[PDB]
């Protein structure tokens, strides 16, 4: 019953191909609810979940104002960072930012987040105190000094402990039938001979929400961590997720192996075997 809200910003320069693109997306847990793309024919914040549609024009206008402003500021920031790293005007570079709030099952703030990266590398992060910064390198220390000078951390703390939590709680109520519903995985084991003396057992989890899940194989009751192939959790496109874990076993030993599934949607964790 814990919940989070996150915004994810991507700003990408593209010398010779116009001004840098800014994209913002917002999520509650594993559900996206808004987007903004400065490359759109008519850039505006758009709904991406049915429960946000009820927000009034003032909401959409305020969001759009914010993201249109951010489009311009992140363009300047990309120029600034290019300078901080003595980089050529010829290369494409990316700033990413992720920020938001985490609530525990009581609805209370657990912690806030605000982190940035440059070309995929940590650049600067707001510490858990919501009051101080961790800069990755001497360029980021320049940003730290600018942000210390401008009282940015104080404003982000006020947001994170205030509006962030308030709006997240509003979304959770408006979207309660989906955001506050855990869909358990549907699970089964398949068997695929690979040779005369070995076979693959693949443990499947399908149709689950949220994305967090644990799938493990045991042999004789011992986790088979080093010998398990585990694919990345993947979206089905209907809000739910899919995952599998596989192990190659000696033929005739299949019943020594058990698949174990943990998911919020399960009252009791599951143990499965191949059923021939």
């Amino acid at each position: 019953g814990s919940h989070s809200m996150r915004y994810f910003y991507t700003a990408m320069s593209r010398p010779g191909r116009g001004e840098p693109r800014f994209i913002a997306v917002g999520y509650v847990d594993d559900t996206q609810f808004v987007r903004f793309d400065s490359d759109a024919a008519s850039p505006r914040t758009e709904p991406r979940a049915p429960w946000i549609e009820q927000e009034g024009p003032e909401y959409w206008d305020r969001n759009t104002q914010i993201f249109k402003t951010n489009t311009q500021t992140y363009r300047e920031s990309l120029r600034n960072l290019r300078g901080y790293y003595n980089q050529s005007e010829a290369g494409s570079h990316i700033i990413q930012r992720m920020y938001g709030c985490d609530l525990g099952p009581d609805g209370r703030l657990l912690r806030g987040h605000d982190q940035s990266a440059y070309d995929g590398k940590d650049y600067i992060a707001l510490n858990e105190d919501l009051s101080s910064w961790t800069a990755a390198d001497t360029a980021a220390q320049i940003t730290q000094r600018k942000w210390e000078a401008a009282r940015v951390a104080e404003q982000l703390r006020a947001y994170l402990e205030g509006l962030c939590v308030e709006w997240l709680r509003r979304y959770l109520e408006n979207g309660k039938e989906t955001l506050q519903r855990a869909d358990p995985p549907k699970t089964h084991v398949t068997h695929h001979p690979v040779s005369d003396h070995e076979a693959t057992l693949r443990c499947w989890a399908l149709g689950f929400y949220p994305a967090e899940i644990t799938l493990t194989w045991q042999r004789d009751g011992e986790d088979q961590t080093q010998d398990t192939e585990l694919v990345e959790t993947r979206p089905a496109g209907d809000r739910t997720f899919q995952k599998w874990a596989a192990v190659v076993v000696p033929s005739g030993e299949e019943q020594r192996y058990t698949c174990h599934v943990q998911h919020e949607g399960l009252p009791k964790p599951l143990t499965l075997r191949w059923e021939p």
């Binding site: 500021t73 300047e76 940035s116 940003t143």
Partner: peptide, 14 residues
């Protein structure tokens, strides 16, 4: 709802 920081657009810069 997203964040709004900064003395000005300028103060939001990295």
């Amino acid at each position: 709802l997203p964040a709004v920081v900064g003395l000005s657009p300028g103060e939001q810069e990295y």
